[PDB]
Ligand binder design. Sequence first.
Ligand SMILES: NC(=O)c1ccc[n+]([C@@H]2O[C@H](COP(=O)([O-])OP(=O)(O)OC[C@H]3O[C@@H](n4cnc5c(N)ncnc54)[C@H](OP(=O)(O)O)[C@@H]3O)[C@@H](O)[C@H]2O)c1
Ligand SMILES: NC(=O)c1ccc[n+]([C@@H]2O[C@H](COP(=O)([O-])OP(=O)(O)OC[C@H]3O[C@@H](n4cnc5c(N)ncnc54)[C@H](OP(=O)(O)O)[C@@H]3O)[C@@H](O)[C@H]2O)c1
Ligand SMILES: NC(=O)c1ccc[n+]([C@@H]2O[C@H](COP(=O)([O-])OP(=O)(O)OC[C@H]3O[C@@H](n4cnc5c(N)ncnc54)[C@H](OP(=O)(O)O)[C@@H]3O)[C@@H](O)[C@H]2O)c1
Ligand SMILES: NC(=O)c1ccc[n+]([C@@H]2O[C@H](COP(=O)([O-])OP(=O)(O)OC[C@H]3O[C@@H](n4cnc5c(N)ncnc54)[C@H](OP(=O)(O)O)[C@@H]3O)[C@@H](O)[C@H]2O)c1
Lengths: 337, 337, 337, 337
Amino acid sequence: MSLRIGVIGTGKIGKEHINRITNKLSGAEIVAVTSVNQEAAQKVVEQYQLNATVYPNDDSLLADENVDAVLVTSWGPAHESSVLKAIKAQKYVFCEKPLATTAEGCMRIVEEEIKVGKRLVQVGFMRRYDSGYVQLKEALDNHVIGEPLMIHCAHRNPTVGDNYTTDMAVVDTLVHEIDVLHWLVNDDYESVQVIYPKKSKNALPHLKDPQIVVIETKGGIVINAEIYVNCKYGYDIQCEIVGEDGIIKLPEPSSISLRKEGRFSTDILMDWQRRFVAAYDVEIQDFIDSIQKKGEVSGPTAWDGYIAAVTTDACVKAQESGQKEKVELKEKPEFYQ
Amino acid sequence: MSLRIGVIGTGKIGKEHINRITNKLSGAEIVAVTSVNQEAAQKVVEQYQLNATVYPNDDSLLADENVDAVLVTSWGPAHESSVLKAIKAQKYVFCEKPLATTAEGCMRIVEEEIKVGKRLVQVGFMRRYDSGYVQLKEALDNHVIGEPLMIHCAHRNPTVGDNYTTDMAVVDTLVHEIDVLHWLVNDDYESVQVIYPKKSKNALPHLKDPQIVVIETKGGIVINAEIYVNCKYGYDIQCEIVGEDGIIKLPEPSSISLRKEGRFSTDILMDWQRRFVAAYDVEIQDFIDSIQKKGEVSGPTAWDGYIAAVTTDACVKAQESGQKEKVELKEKPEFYQ
Amino acid sequence: MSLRIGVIGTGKIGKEHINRITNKLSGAEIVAVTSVNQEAAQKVVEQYQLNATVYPNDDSLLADENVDAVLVTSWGPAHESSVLKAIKAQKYVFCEKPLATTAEGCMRIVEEEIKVGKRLVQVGFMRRYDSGYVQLKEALDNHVIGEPLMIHCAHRNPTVGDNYTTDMAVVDTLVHEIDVLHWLVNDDYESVQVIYPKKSKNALPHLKDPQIVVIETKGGIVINAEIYVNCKYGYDIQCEIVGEDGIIKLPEPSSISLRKEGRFSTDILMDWQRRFVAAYDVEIQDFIDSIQKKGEVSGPTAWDGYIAAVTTDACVKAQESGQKEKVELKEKPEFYQ
Amino acid sequence: MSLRIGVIGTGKIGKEHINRITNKLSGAEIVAVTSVNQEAAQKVVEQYQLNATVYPNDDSLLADENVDAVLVTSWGPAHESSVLKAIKAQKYVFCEKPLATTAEGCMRIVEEEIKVGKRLVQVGFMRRYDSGYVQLKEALDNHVIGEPLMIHCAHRNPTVGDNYTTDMAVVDTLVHEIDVLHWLVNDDYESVQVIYPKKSKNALPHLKDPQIVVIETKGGIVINAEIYVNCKYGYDIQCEIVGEDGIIKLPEPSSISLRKEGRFSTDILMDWQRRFVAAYDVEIQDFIDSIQKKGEVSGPTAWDGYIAAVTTDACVKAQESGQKEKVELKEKPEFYQ
Ligand SMILES: NC(=O)c1ccc[n+]([C@@H]2O[C@H](COP(=O)([O-])OP(=O)(O)OC[C@H]3O[C@@H](n4cnc5c(N)ncnc54)[C@H](OP(=O)(O)O)[C@@H]3O)[C@@H](O)[C@H]2O)c1
Ligand SMILES: NC(=O)c1ccc[n+]([C@@H]2O[C@H](COP(=O)([O-])OP(=O)(O)OC[C@H]3O[C@@H](n4cnc5c(N)ncnc54)[C@H](OP(=O)(O)O)[C@@H]3O)[C@@H](O)[C@H]2O)c1
Ligand SMILES: NC(=O)c1ccc[n+]([C@@H]2O[C@H](COP(=O)([O-])OP(=O)(O)OC[C@H]3O[C@@H](n4cnc5c(N)ncnc54)[C@H](OP(=O)(O)O)[C@@H]3O)[C@@H](O)[C@H]2O)c1
Ligand SMILES: NC(=O)c1ccc[n+]([C@@H]2O[C@H](COP(=O)([O-])OP(=O)(O)OC[C@H]3O[C@@H](n4cnc5c(N)ncnc54)[C@H](OP(=O)(O)O)[C@@H]3O)[C@@H](O)[C@H]2O)c1
């Protein structure tokens, strides 16, 4: 019957996932809430009419035996702590990115989970659940294009706020590409390099934008990723995989077409929140269903969180040094193989 | 909440709706089933692990006061009888097409609903809930192309069985177009004409396929619909609306692209079930949510069912006469505004 | 050496053809011109720096023994006379549409050419030389889609002058479709029907625009053609051929794409003269080349002119009567086989 | 009257140019040819039925006072020689790439031309005359997308023979991109870097294919160019320019579309000779018209040839070293401004 879920962190995306579980998905219910702000957390149970005790902290909510699983949706740097705790409490955990702000912290989560002996942790890299990326994965697995040789991608955003900084280009933005690409081609990153084109007029003086990130896999796949967060025209994810015998490419989001005033056109999304809305529903549903059927989670793993953490670090180092940097990856544990 | 739902008819679409409510959607559960094969209904309850009572018939299912609403997913020609009974028992009813196999059948349902004083009946014309059609209607209502003048559409299917007959081209197939178009442009159908191109080699000698159906609305919009149920290449829905100042067009379903062996290509679906899957989820969720929030349904009405019935009747007439036929619609009751 | 060409009618089209012959194409030169405004004629000679006599009329131009061939680019109604005179003078003739203003006019020209005993007359239906239509013809002749069953096309124009009349929709505009389609599918027209949507706000009150013209071939191919000469958005030619086993479609004219301000777009041409510029070059070059290589022309024939006339007449009839009208088509002389 | 053209080298490209001049274009004729293969040369004169003299060498041909201009279409390394001889004879010269096999060779040509005092040398970089590239240039010069920041391009080929070497990837292939991009964005190259992904199974082991070349301009435009000469699927040129406020992209070559067997598709050329046939006609016609109207040529210059040589040299340097290499360009002479 219903999977009982506690929510750690009721900001925007905590409110979204709650709405999801309460009003859209099957098999689960929100029974507990927290942080930080005792208020607001109470305002959230109000807003959504929840049968939910407002606990004052992780351990508190995590103490409850009427909670089977948790969503960690709080401030990024807070994640590692709550995840560790929930693992010790042996509850299933869905953790929004990042798993932890350091590779060391991801490694600690990895260590703990391996002790429990089964997969409790799923990281919220929703792109793997998007129908376009699923199709790309299927085509590759069915050897449609032969071996992958190169990947060209772009992650574009119309404009960012004052506080968006150069490192966020890789840490908050490219991390999605970083997680999804190694999954697609099943190969590990080896080296990264960052090249800066002239700065766009739309970027604030403190921010280096756009940038080009070149990544090589151990297999020798070269990825060039454009990141351009002040592109003005829209929010835009583009991904092209070049293989030996052919090329596959991610599709545009669905739009009606329009002939009008001398132009034939389709819409480009302006809002990042509309790009992957279905994927978010799918990943949470899969969280719920995996548990109810397999006694463990199925999505991106604690190791995937670690791979991202390490890769983003090398990228930031590449941003600073302007040189080709190594990606320091431990061999993958048997437990995640 | 938990809307408590009884299913009348546990065939293919019945089982798929049961799956949706049980494993995909929010706010409802299946508590009762009935079918003409009572053991078949039992297997379904087994298969989906339902906490549901198997009833011998719809009368007794409708007698169960723990049943809030029903789905009528039985044999087409039997829908009308089940709907009438559900209206008298005052349950909400989601009826798969058709509502009734005759205009008179629909009119009977219409006046029974008007007696009850609120909306009980929602007809399963799922295209209205498809994002493409929603986008088309949004554009229209925002005056993007001015007044609609012409609609060019096509409904294509790879192949049909031995028992698909000429009348089914309009009754089972074009009926989807007939419902969605008058809704899109807010106009009533006035007349229809059927034109037969040479028979396709892919069609059995008793079937006339393809067909062209020309429809004129009262306001003077002209619709040209191509029906070709043996097109071989795929399942394909196309729709273009030509307005005074511009043209809008329904998108292709999402697909990765492929460059390979001298061709740049995307997928065309082979399977009608894959085309509108999301729409079915949305329509049923809307049935549930409208009831739980407004105490009445919100989708295609019994009146839309009537409109479809009158129009397909005129189309069948036109198939046999080769002449322009009037669509004789009674004025729309104030109840259905 | 050069094919020596005289030009009858030195208005807009006459000047453009003179331009391509003088400055773009191989193997010909203008040696004579005539008009009606004997100032503009002398003017064109100087503007294009031509070593050419200006004559006062066709008779005197056709008298000139060093003229090998003529282009008839005069006022529409005057074409027939000049073509006839040229045939009697035994000169080759490229005649801009229309060959004549009546089917009888076209038939007369057909008879004189048969008397001359070889092909002198090429009619300027340039679409057959457009690379997109050439590709459609080639796909059809390679049996890529099976037998053609239906054709859907549109001929759209941003706006017309107040002189444009309802009959001109089929006589001046659809006549291009009428020619190209029977050529593409190698079939004769049998019947036509015209349906009027409500009048567009962009159309003057005396003009019925847009129009839908339904044409059936003897073999049972059904053509649905949309004509909309005040569509505002652009000049647009669309053509989709539905065959038994698949569908082929004319491409958009080439254009860079643009992502900007929330839209992904390509250009739609605003003026008809840019649409087929290459085809005009190819058709004239073919006129020159065929004459020099074979001693007769090879393009659209006087008989093709006749077919267009008879089909347009039947369309004008359908315009007035609102009924299905027969295309009164005489049998094709072996001379044109 | 006619520009009298001599052709040096009657290989494949030489033959094509003779064909367009003799049978397609305006205002010139072939009056002289020479080739290392005498029989081939005389056979070309028969084949195209030329009114031309076969000369045993370029000295003879260039000494012919009835020769106004020459096309140099001989073996690559022999180009420099013929170009210098032609400038000395003060003949107009269309030189197929490369201008010379070294930057030194090009510099000597630059030197001799400046002495003459006018432009005699046009280099055969035809992409500049392609309608797609012209539209890109027009959009950029109208500042449709603001300042260019990044360019992503690809040059792909189905297969190469056993002669093709790693250096030819930049020397014979990328050289087209190298010329067209600095022309598009009006900026000079600064540094280049080469990255090798894993080798394609379609490549002979003596060849490194594919390659990624990264070029920075002095203004800070970053260019990422994929070269892949055994991509199997087709010949394919892609080019996307990312600007501050928008993105413009080269179109696919014109193709009809096809729906068939579960795919919606367009053709991809397999044959490089088909991608740019129109550009070749336009470039040669430009050569002829510029001479006849301005007394000097006006396409890509000897200086453009020199840029290509230096930039290609540095790319080959980067190929061997694996490091970011400098493009050492001298100051552009006033003669070429
Ligand atoms: N998977 C995806 O596609 C996706 C998409 C978006 C976000 N995320 C991730 O989800 C996590 C949380 O995101 P969010 O947008 O929901 O966060 P949020 O609402 O900004 O943060 C959650 C709560 O913490 C408070 N807070 C945290 N740090 C604060 C500070 N320094 N000052 C003031 N209040 C602070 C917030 O208050 P304030 O109102 O003042 O912030 C809010 O009450 C992040 O790790 C983010 O990267 C993932
Ligand atoms: N909205 C849509 O797009 C959509 C899509 C599909 C279907 N539908 C509609 O939903 C309804 C049911 O569809 P379905 O595909 O589930 O149908 P189905 O499985 O073929 O038929 C449903 C039930 O009717 C019975 N039945 C079928 N033919 C019969 C006949 N000739 N005589 C007596 N009983 C008969 C079946 O018996 P058995 O138990 O022996 O099979 C089954 O119990 C139909 O009216 C159909 O038009 C709508
Ligand atoms: N193949 C195609 O796609 C295509 C495209 C465009 C046109 N065409 C055809 O080519 C022909 C010429 O077209 P256009 O646009 O060049 O036409 P135009 O210039 O208007 O007509 C040619 C000349 O006719 C003169 N004229 C007009 N009315 C006259 C009258 N009643 N009596 C005597 N002379 C008269 C005008 O004299 P002034 O010089 O004093 O004005 C004009 O120069 C047309 O029949 C048209 O259908 C074909
Ligand atoms: N703009 C463009 O896109 C483009 C396209 C293609 C080529 N090109 C350029 O045009 C030039 C010639 O190209 P192509 O493909 O036409 O060459 P080709 O036909 O192989 O050679 C052209 C001429 O050089 C001779 N030749 C060829 N190989 C030779 C060798 N190994 N030693 C001595 N003489 C030799 C040929 O005579 P034999 O037959 O007796 O060898 C012929 O007269 C090259 O510089 C090439 O890069 C440019």
